[model samples]
Target: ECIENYAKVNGIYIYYKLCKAPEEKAKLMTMHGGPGMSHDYLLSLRDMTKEGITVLFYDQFGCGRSEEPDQSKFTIDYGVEEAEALRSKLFGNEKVFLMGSAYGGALALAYAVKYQDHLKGLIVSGGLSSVPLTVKEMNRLIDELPAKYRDAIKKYGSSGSYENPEYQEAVNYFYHQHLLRSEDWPPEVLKSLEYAERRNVYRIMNGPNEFTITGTIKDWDITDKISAIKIPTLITVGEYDEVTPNVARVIHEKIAGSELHVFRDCSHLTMWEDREGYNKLLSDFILKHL
Candidate 1:
């Protein structure tokens, strides 16, 4: 009924899922964010199967079903190479559409910029182009929070005390405001966070918290190169996504001919916040471009 598989890309084994659809339908490869989170939450996207689009999900080099390699091996360049390899190894000569969310959205952009020859289209949902810009936006959001919570994050952020209850409590304000507004976050969304806490990739590439960037990839920014990419790109984001409407707009404005849709009353987990609506928009986009 499904294909659960792994491929040895670079030195690590990347794990993935394929919910098969009719061969005539387009194939979608979905990537998760966190720079370390698993594809568990993205599994919701398999709803596309009902629309006749085959859906795929995968974890990065150091999370979920994939091999957790040494931290020394983690790099954005490595991720892009593995992404390109994952697509080629799975679909071969066939053109495959890439659908990435959050950090995966950035990864999708990197892959498309480098390997457009191997792609059919790109779907970036709540994706980012500038890590510095994303961090700035989160800090700006923090300023809007109650002073007590704002001070908690500001006071402890540099101490690397993310495990402290006070710090986490403050961070939750940011999440509830822009990450996922749902009263009960789905298990899959929680699972990705659980995986992120246990992995070094997030700590190594991102940092202890989403707003902080004390990692090797802290300076990683690709905003200047998005315009060079040529492909049918669909840019989607929540109205209050952590990636922010301005961030999404930058991508939409640069990637010429790219279509965009902002899900109202939504946040970072736009797909979860607007379940049926997100699925319909994504399916229709792929189908229309196909």
Candidate 2:
């Protein structure tokens, strides 16, 4: 619940905490996804604090408790640098565990590439190994959908009209089917979504919706250098994740010796879709590696 500010090349608003654990030996920092997404969706991991591991969560620039930066400032490089800034401020020279989900995963790897010496281990859930591959996979999934839904998605995507009734309808269908399958929407998750839409960073980096791939990050890729990551890495994705098994597997392959796990009966939102199992997997991995 702690709120702070991170002043890097461009000032950023950050909300984070060093969860007080009984043992207090392991400190882990959790990074959220969506170049524009807030950290609320990942708050479920706060349960990890009781396991004697300190957890740190923060809202990156332009989202949640952070200052709203211009869309131009939301690139991967800025994200990695911001993580380093926050890490230095909170942990100083002490080593800490790193966990990232989806886009956060990409940022985590980028951070590891430059700050591996400062990390004890790495955990990535639903992270994309390559942006182009992610787009390709997403397109494939959309293509597999019934023609009516597929056509609606195409019309909305090319219309540049996010507010269009048809577009909103298609988005709702996509989110319900892929984002969070829970019948009752969680408050935090809803708030994160609302804040993200307000900031509009998604439109700049991720296009109108999750399934639409017409944004600045569409061509982003780091597979060529992922092999240089030398830390213990664990990758996880849901069986029905938009990230897909093939994409996650490629990331595992690129990062030499990395481990991969697929959650059963889970989609992209494994944290909420299968909370108990997700937390157990995360806790076990952190304890064993950290």
Model 1 lDDT tens row, 97-172: 9988988998888888888777889999999888888888777878888998898887887677888799999888
Q: Write the per-residue lDDT of candidate 2 for residues 213-253, one digit (tens) a residue.
A: 67788888988878888888889998878788788898899
Error of 2 at 247 (Å): 1.2
lDDT of each: 0.85, 0.80
- What residue runs in model 2 are displaced by over 4 Å at the alpha carbon? 1-10
TM for every model, in the order presented, reads 0.96, 0.93
Best by lDDT: 1
In angstroms, the error of model 1 at 169 is 0.7
Overlapping backbone residue pairs in candidate 2 total 2
Clash pairs, candidate 1, are none
For candidate 2, which ten residues in a row score worst on lDDT?
A: 1-10
